[PDB]
């Protein structure tokens with residue numbers, strides 16, 4: 001065996017460890033600043049169109065059929081504009097955009113920033129400003145990875161590594177700016193967006209710089225109200241931690257069931273239009289118009305879902321209301337994401353996991369009155385457990401819920417629920433969702449090849 | 451290129467992503483429970499020996515040269531027991547042990563668990579029970595990684611995946627149970643301890659299982675106070691975050707100077723004994739007995755340093771006292787670690803970084819009164835910043851300080867300080883220290899049998 005030359009190379013490699021060149025480190029600060037500025041202008045444009053829509057529903061308050069007509073039509077034309085931009089100019093800007101950057105980090109999936117960037121921005125502004133059940137982390141990760149490719153072409157950085165670092169720097173900075181979550185942005189690249197089956201040269205120090213330069217832009221220019229702001233919930237005694245494994249087992253079964261509902265609704269809604277230009281846009285105006293109609297009446301069934309998360313965690317919702325919200329937010333998420341709308345499924349998975357967790361917590365409170373439980377500790381453990389059972393990135397989602405809810409006393413319930421979600425997803429035969437979107441787009445790409 | 455074939459390999463690989471076998475997942479629960487039970491017996495044995503040491507200092511409280519004698523001699527005999535077990539039976543159990551598990555994950559540096567497990571336990575009990583400036587995470591990561599190899603030969607699991615996962619499971623469970631830090635245990639494997647220059651199939655889901663099983667054992671059998679119990683501190687305004695960049699620059703310059711002092715004291719303490727076991731044991735009794743002497747008079751200059759972190763962090767130290775503590779704790783950290791005692795640098799780097807961060811925040815208060823600062827926010831940022839400059843694992847040290855201080859409002863101060871500590875350690879020529887000890891160990895056993 002020739003391990004004494006593998007030892008000789010390793011001593012050389014250990015003494016050049018963590019030696020990113022200065023051009024990659026400087027350009028990662030240029031990428032992350034531009035990502036953090038583009039994500040602020042995206043959030044300021046989405047929140048402008050939402051308050052322009054809600055302002056148009058308090059003006060015509062004396063005519064309820066006209067008030068429901070405006071709620072349908074303002075969100076229809078906003079979604080029809082967003083569907084048209086994807087279908088005419090950049091078809092890879094439809095859906096999340098995270099498998100488009102994951103496919104780009106392993107050298108498939110070309111990064112057409114001259115098309116995707118003024119499509120995923122303005123078309124995600126119409127779908128998310130129209131009140132559809134879509135996250136801003138869909139657009140901002142693909143906008144971020146395309147900005148990192150946009151700053152690879154202006155300054156002409158040569159190198160295989162510098163392509164993979166800066167494309168991953170902006171994708172990390174786009175997730176970090178969407179959630180105000182810097183640790184979850186870096187951990188999304190190490191765990192999920194990494195090429196999982198080979199060694200890649202992505203400098204994590206450059207991914208750090210772009211995340212932090214993006215989070216500094218969240219300070220100066222973004223002025224909002226700290227998206228998830230649940231309080232300081234109760235502690236979790238360590239004899240009740242088996243109840244968070246039951247919750248993770250429940251999540252780990254629904255997770256694979258939810259993924260084949262995402263992939264099945266993509267094939268089901270594609271048979272409606274047949275890939276046609278105007279039938280896809282007219283269907284997307286009906287999906288977006290319904291979610292603007294379901295944002296005036298029953299408003300906790302549409303939107304991204306961060307509103308209902310503090311109304312959950314042992315709040316206003318009864319058990320019959322929690323069942324109705326969960327079923328309706330499954331249908332509206334499946335209609336929004338599995339249709340080609342620019343917008344992610346990652347943040348609607350946060351709201352679907354919170355509702356399932358607090359519905360489980362309401363049962364665990366009534367069943368076990370000796371543990372002195374509240375329903376809100378299970379809504380925090382469940383919040384990142386649909387991200388663990390469907391996207392299969394538990395380390396990102398446990399950290400992300402820690403960034404957003406700020407309850408470290410519930411961290412061991414969170415890791416127990418996030419583990420049992422991943423374990424039972426593997427046991428019941430589910431794949432990670434972004435891998436399965438990518439495995440379908442690359443199989444469709446090779447089926448169009450003659 | 452012929453990228454038709456590598457796309458088809460990617461389709462097959464994404465469809466069977468996250469597919470750990472049942473035996474590796476079940477054995478990681480066996481490993482993590484065993485590391486969690488071995489860590490609890492380690493921390494209770496260190497705390498029992500330290501309590502019998504301070505209990506002898508209340509009997510002879512009237513004869514002042516006598517309780518200086520028995521504070522020297524009780525720590526000298528306990529350290530001599532720790533140095534004799536390493537020098538006779540397991541020489542790779544001296545020092546931290548993180549480079550020994552790092553080398554083992556790259557198939558150098560064999561795991562002789564039949565001797566390193568009784569030596570690192572009872573020798574680390576003698577060196578930490580005597581009050582040396584050493585962390586217990588050194589004798590818990592290596593003891594954990596040996597348990598993961600011990601539960602590989604009893605049940606006879608084969609393959610490079612099972613060997614590397616269970617070795618990284620126990621090493622992650624050893625860091626998690628040493629600090630009650632489950633997220634920092636998982637993140638230490640994905641960032642520092644893994645092979646850095648090749649692809650390794652370490653199953654990260656089984657690393658979760660061992661981390662969970664070790665921190666669950668931290669409940670049922672370990673009943674002690676929190677290690678660091680600093681409270682809730684000031685919300686750091688974003689116009690003051692340039693000061694945490696300067697704090698990272700000071701750490702990033704000192705970190706390489708500290709690393710040359712670690713490896714430079716390893717070389718000149720080795721010239722005192724010359725590898726002779728009797729002179730090595732008598733040197734470790736003088737070094738370990740002095741820290742028991744410094745444990746009675748001026749106890750802030752000795753020990754693991756978790757006690758002085760709440761007395762720092764906007765606390766009751768002066769400027770001249772805090773400067774005296776830093777200089778005296780650098781001397782005692784280098785005398786304990788670089789002499790080959792079982793024990794780590796990781797937790798005395800947390801104490802050294804808190805003291806340096808407190809002294810920087812004390813200067814920044816009197817230099818910038820318009821920012822309305824307190825010195826404790828810079829102590830939290832500084833606490834993981836020597837781990838960013840010396841160990842060059844910023845993501846683990848930022849998370850580890852977040853596990854044990856519970857101050858998420860300083861997360862953007864914590865990463866700016868850790869980024870500038872990693873940036874200025876790279877540009878001033880510093881290496882990561884566990885990679886520098888490993889490459890010095892790998893080059894040493896190469897030149898004797900080449």
Ligand SMILES: [Cl-]
Pocket residue numbers: 094095096097098099437
């Ligand atoms: Cl998608």
Ligand SMILES: [Cl-]
Pocket residue numbers: 096098135137138343344345346347
């Ligand atoms: Cl998404």
Ligand SMILES: [Cl-]
Pocket residue numbers: 544545546547548549887
């Ligand atoms: Cl060492």
Ligand SMILES: [Cl-]
Pocket residue numbers: 546548585587588793794795796797
């Ligand atoms: Cl250490």
